[PDB]
Symmetry: C3
């Protein structure tokens, strides 16, 4: 144990975004209801100068059937950021998950992935790319003046698949062209001022890192205007090692790319939740102290790499809301709690908060 | 002697604020008449991108009797800053000096500090906190869109007093609650965008440093939204040592606090003015050269700590106006002159100017 | 050979200005036609956040006869920068080249440099300084709200001339007073917010460096409001050595001066073009790899000196347009091609691009 400053309320504790003002933005993923929850709204105004929609801007949320755009939840998050002078990230224009099946049906209502006529396959490819372009055109035309950071594609690399290309219907139907078109359409509709990212997880693992590096070079060679890599950084206390994170950021920086940490959380367990504690009160202090040392190591690394990192965004606000609790229950027969942030479920600061707010 | 660049006019000499553009703001304390004095106004526009009122915004200046707000002098300083794109600091919402006695009278016209009925003392405490809240509400509502930096309380720690709490009437009547309320009211009226400081002098001395650190932690534990510490830095050529200054800034940074240097001057004498020179022309060059080396050491330290220091403000413009001349005369039987700045009384640069403007 | 990343199109390659966002602006010299050439305009929007007129704002371009101001070409460049949020530099208010002869004729139509009556010479000096003041007044009044960076005088030092002062008609008629007046008039018309530079080439050579340093100190002693030195940096692969560049920047920083690199190019040849290659396709890869290592060394030096350098501007966009091709032909009997940029004549990135865009 090394962090023994008091567990004060986070609502008025010194601002995390302030601490990192000349390093990178400090962001949080939010749901629309949190923009009007008193404590969550206060937490955002106190600690965060960047916001991303955890779920409200995924493809199925915004265009659940063709041409039927659903803007209300997304507008709510954008308006909260505008009211409070926060930057925004867009999650996400393209993803194999959270994508409605109408994209991948031919004009006949049948799955394009089953088509065997080569000329018809080329027509389906053209049609799917037009649908993708229209999804992007609508969303970027609406938000381009307010959202500067765009996860144009998400999780398109899978090292277990041939050539490293995740074999989603996107890839089955268009190869890598859906990725090329996604970036071109985003630039066409949004102009030079928006920053376009390829977002993925385990970006430091090999050979996934090579595959992402290879893909970006291939896209660059095709004239694709990519600006950066987003690193989800869903990490644990021990994995991955900090030196591998450092080499990954430097590596993509060598292609001229900006880097953002997009979905940061530090689980208390391994991958998978080998044994979750059942309740929050059951987590011993030693675990939070271990998590504090890990957060310290991460953020001091981010400071060293500050000229290659424009933003660090957490995948949530406080420990009362995190996607890791679904996984904790799942692998522990219905009961389990994770604690991945620097703010606890009662909106108090954790040892990890003091570890990243201090002078180093 | 080490600084032999010419003693050019400061009016058009290279800008001090420019030199520190990516480190911290460079500020000066001013009186309203100096916003319309040709040479002082030019000096501010040339060298400073932050302004503070030396006297015009103290409690007795702004609310000399209850509810009788006097805005003219303060408005003048704020308008000069706005015309010239300068940031502002507010000195100061609460101070045991420069505070009119009406605050501390019960509704009966008698000193609250003399009251012996416990229930009546609690009523006086409530009344004094309401008067404090109204003073802050009026001032912050008026200036919140123009002043980002607020000395919410000033000089509230005194190591000679029990528990380190300066035993002013504020503390005699309310304990530390006046400090809690001062910060809460300032945040309530001004929003999250204004930065709230506790300002004091000798912040590197022990045990004063501990007492300030202890008090801030206690206020943080009560939910108080403090953002930073202001260090007056009324220093001499030899005191305090630079390593103690460094440890102080780092120490408060460890609580997540920003730091500003708020009232910087480097006296030519010890504490007290053991022997002032009678006139400015009597000061030998060796003294200015010693003062230059001291200013060099201070500002190179500030550069090293730049990510913990947002602003460095001098307690005046040029050597023709400084509060240290009152003290120089006082302790030298009516005659005496100090020279605490980098600009001399004829608006020429001093060796100290060249020492902090150069490449290091 | 060390840089083997692909020679992708530069039009959508990761942004150079983005890479240097927290170091200095990245600029390019342009001609008006390039603001409407599809590829040049795209290159500026992709890679550059600062623009300078290669020729359209020289004295003869803007005021070819007395009082006959020609604004169209200059306005075009300023409007392109404004549309795209780019900063601007002004090249240049005073220069011995590109200056129409009407400046230097007495009211009698005869060359002021030939006048032998001392009282008449003082009248011509006064008249030439009034004409200079009016040229500057007109240009600064028109553009002061849009152009922050002003090359007030250009190439006024010549180490082969007595006292180091280039013996142009400006100096023959007014001594150094034309320089004093140029800076004062620019400040008078433009205010404190515009930054005023003395621009020259070979600024690291001795004794030219001493002469510039000496002149600036003399101007500072006369009350002249100079803010910075512009270093043209028309360099080769081997000259000048990087340590001499470093000492030059530090040296002028010691006078409190900002520094900008104003006309950067890295010729493939010596001075003069000892042997140009006849055509672009004749340049071997080894030369581009040598040029890449040189650009790497320069920009890593600029990063180290980032707090003394506000902007780095290239004297052109891509290798299809550069003034060095006139000199390559000249000294090679009509045929010759240089390649001084990081972007090639077909708007593809060069090894030098990868060398300055990477993580270091
Ligand atoms: Na730095
Ligand atoms: Na989720
Ligand atoms: Na005073
Ligand atoms: Na030219």
């Amino acid at each position: 144990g090394s962090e023994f400053k008091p567990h004060i309320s986070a609502l008025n504790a010194p601002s995390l975004a302030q601490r990192y003002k000349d390093y990178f933005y400090i962001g949080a993923a939010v749901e629309p209801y949190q923009t009007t929850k008193e404590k969550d709204a206060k937490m955002l105004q106190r600690h965060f100068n960047m916001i991303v929609a955890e779920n409200a801007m995924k493809p199925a949320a915004l265009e659940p059937t063709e041409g039927n755009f659903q803007w209300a939840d997304a507008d709510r998050i954008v308006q909260f950021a505008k009211e409070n002078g926060m930057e925004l990230r867009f999650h996400t224009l393209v993803w194999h998950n959270q994508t409605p099946d109408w994209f991948f049906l031919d004009r006949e209502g049948k799955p394009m992935v089953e088509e065997t006529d080569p000329q018809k396959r080329e027509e389906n490819r053209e049609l799917l790319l037009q649908r993708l372009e229209n999804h992007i055109r609508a969303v970027v035309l609406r938000y381009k003046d307010d959202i500067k950071n765009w996860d144009v594609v998400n999780e398109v690399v899978e090292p277990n698949d041939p050539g490293g290309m995740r074999n989603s219907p996107w890839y089955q139907i268009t190869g890598t062209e859906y990725i090329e078109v996604a970036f071109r359409a985003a630039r066409e509709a949004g102009g030079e001022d928006i920053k376009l990212y390829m977002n993925d997880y385990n970006t430091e693992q090999e050979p996934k890192r090579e595959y992402i590096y290879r893909l970006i070079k291939k896209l660059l060679e095709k004239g694709v205007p990519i600006d950066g890599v987003g690193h989800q950084a869903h990490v644990t206390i021990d994995r991955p090692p900090v030196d591998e994170i450092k080499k990954t950021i430097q590596r993509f920086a060598d292609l001229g790319l900006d880097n953002q940490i997009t979905e940061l959380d530090v689980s208390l367990y391994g991958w998978p939740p080998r044994p979750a504690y059942p309740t929050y009160d059951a987590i011993p202090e030693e675990r939070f102290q271990a998590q504090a040392d890990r957060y310290r190591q991460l953020f001091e690394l981010f400071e060293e790499l500050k000229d290659h990192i424009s933003a660090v965004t957490f995948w949530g606000i406080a420990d009362n809301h995190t996607w890791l609790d679904d996984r904790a229950r799942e692998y522990n027969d219905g009961v389990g709690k994770d604690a991945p942030f620097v703010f606890d479920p009662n909106y108090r600061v954790k040892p990890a908060y003091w570890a990243i707010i201090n002078h180093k």
